[PDB]
Amino acid sequence: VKVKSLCTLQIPEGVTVDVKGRKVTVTGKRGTLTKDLTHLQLDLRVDKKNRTFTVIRWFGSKIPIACLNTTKAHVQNMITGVTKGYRFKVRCAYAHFPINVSVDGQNIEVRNFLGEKRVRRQLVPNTVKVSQTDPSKVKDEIVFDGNDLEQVSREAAVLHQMCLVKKKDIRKFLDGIYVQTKTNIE
Amino acid sequence: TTSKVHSQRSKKLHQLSAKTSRVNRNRKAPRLYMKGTLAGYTRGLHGQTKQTALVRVENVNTREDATWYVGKRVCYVYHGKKVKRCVRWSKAPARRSTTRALWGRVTRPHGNAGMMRVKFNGASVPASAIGRRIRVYLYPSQI
Amino acid sequence: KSHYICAGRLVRILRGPRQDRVGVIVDIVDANRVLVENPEDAKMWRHVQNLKNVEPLKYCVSVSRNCSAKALKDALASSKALEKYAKTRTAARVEAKKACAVSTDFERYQLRVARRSRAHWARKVFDEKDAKTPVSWHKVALKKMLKKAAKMDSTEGAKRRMQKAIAAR
Amino acid sequence: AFPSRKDAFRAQRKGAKKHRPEIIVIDLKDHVLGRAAAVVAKQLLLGKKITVVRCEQLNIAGTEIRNKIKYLQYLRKRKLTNPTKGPFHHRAPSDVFVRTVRSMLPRYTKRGMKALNSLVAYEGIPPNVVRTGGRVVIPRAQRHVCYRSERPYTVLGNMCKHVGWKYSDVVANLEKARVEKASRHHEKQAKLRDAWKSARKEALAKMPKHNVEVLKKFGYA
RNA sequence: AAAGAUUAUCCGUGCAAAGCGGACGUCGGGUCGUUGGGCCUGGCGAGCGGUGGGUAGUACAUGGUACGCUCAUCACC
RNA sequence: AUCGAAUCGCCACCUACAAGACUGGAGCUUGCUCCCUCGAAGGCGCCAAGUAUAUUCAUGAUCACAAGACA
Ligand SMILES: [Mg+2]
Ligand SMILES: [Mg+2]
Incomplete structure (x- = not known):
């Protein structure tokens, strides 16, 4: 096995990273985030003076070593979340029946999908903000805003999976709700 | 009739003020034997041989530990239903009791974990003694 | 922070015939074995130890891998790691365990009276302090009832019962 | 369980005190469920009286789904002609531990049932x-000494809750109240704990000097 | 299950707190063993009560219970 | 009240909690250095209420369930 494998990450000036028992807390402007990595069995160190995050695997085979690059990506996503945020733009694509999307406070209503009378409802958790773009700029666009990339995604994915065409040729019936832009709030 | 809480308060008041940090001290008759338990008899998958018994003694967990007890006298203490004859029945009438003892000796160690083989005087130890207390004395002394 | 396994690291042997002896790592064979040696211990010539049988200590001398016996001896003396280690509490405990193991029945009696004497004087000190500021169960409860008892016992009826039944004694 | 009036009358005649x-x-x-059961089963056969607590926090190696499926395969075994008097599948974590110990004992002998009846199991720690x-623990x-920490493991209470155990929330609420009460009591009695620590430290200056040297020789000062 | 002169030596309240709020008395006797001693018992009272006598209004589904006042009796005692 | 019994460690300091990929506390250099309570003891209990000026032990006669046990 490999004695020592490690990955390094540079922490920007405006964000602080704390590690304690494989529990990572990333605090910056525009909010803070916490991740529980007690399932990973790694060695996490933060150099506060030098602004570096390090994850080390001692005496690891391929499977444990595959986790340290995953850990670095998760911490990097948290750093980006508390500095720029995450914004997912969602477009309703339809051929004949307009997809009427009603966005109340944290509540999404989808109507007339393929002319169906059933109403599709989704409750967005309070950590994610959902807004509907004014139709004058871009038609039937839904925007998901939040700090956690994991939470901002699968809010649009849940929206996509609710408006799925059943018992039809999906090559021909392309109606649905699809993410179009993945970007940052700031 | 005046309620007893008035006299009870006075007794409580004096006892709590007269209380000091005193501990319980064990100054009773000493124990001169190691505590053991009868695990059973020597046996294999074919069955057991009751002429030899297996005794596990507390704090004896090595074969070298068990070798120290080879030759020691072993006693199993129980009680019957009636008072029968005993040693010093007439010399010491206070000894008369339903308590009975069966005596044996440690013959050899058993395994590597401090288990001991015990042979009892003439007869075999009853199977009702399995899981019960066995006394392992320090005599005959070799020190 | 845990102490790494490295050349020059001081270790204590956990089990085996060299149990509770101190050596220096000197060299690392693989993930499982090292080459411990201690010039100041007679039974601690250069030999292989499994890493599961060593406990790294907070002291590391400056030697290279496969260092000469003279170089290790000079580094061990100059760093004073053994002198520093002997002043720790764990080193004292190891010496204490050896003293108890070879103790006689008379020394066991001497320890028994020494611990009993300390136990007696701890009680004397504790009770003297508990009188000033109550901290035990009996002194805290007594303080909790003195105010109520004084209020209730100061009544005229209680005082009549005071003398009328004390005089009978 | 509840003592008889004859038993209480005899005790008062004897004038004995409380006995445990x-x-x-x-x-x-x-x-670990299996290793704890094997150790406890041997101790019961040696005449020990054992009470086990926090059975809902036992561990089994593997994912929760794998061990849930293992229990569901045990649940499907039943006497077809009469499910009564069939195999009785107990869902509570304490009964799961008791069943595990029972299969490690000679349960069809009087000696085996004497060992089994000497074990008491609880969920959490009752008052x-x-x-x-x-x-005590079984090292x-x-x-943390038996499993490699990379491997997934299941908690017995989490597995039991999804196969029929209905008191997972009751045990969790009771355990939360117990720890708060014990923590409050332990937050108190700190003054008593430090008072005895200073009494032992100050007593070194009051005992005879040669007694202090004996304490230092055996590492007690 | 309780939570303490080792469950005895009172009841609430509080967090196994800090505290706080309550408690029927009095006059004798007998009988056993460190302080207004345990237990048993008698006479005067008081209080909380259980039944019945005499009385008033009211409640409840309206025969049948409760409740005010006042006597007698019993119990804690 | 038969009833003689087997059992032989007490506590109002353990009798709270959590983690062993890191739980005495810091630093940056991230595995080394530095500070500390130095990281390997639940406290008592084992015959003078405490380490000393002391004091009844027999004939229960050399083992025998301790002939006794509210610590
Ligand atoms: Mg009276
Ligand atoms: Mg581990």
């Missing part, structure tokens, strides 16, 4: 056991 048998209380939290004395059956 020598009982070992094991904290089963983060203990009648809280103050009975210090709890050779503990999770």
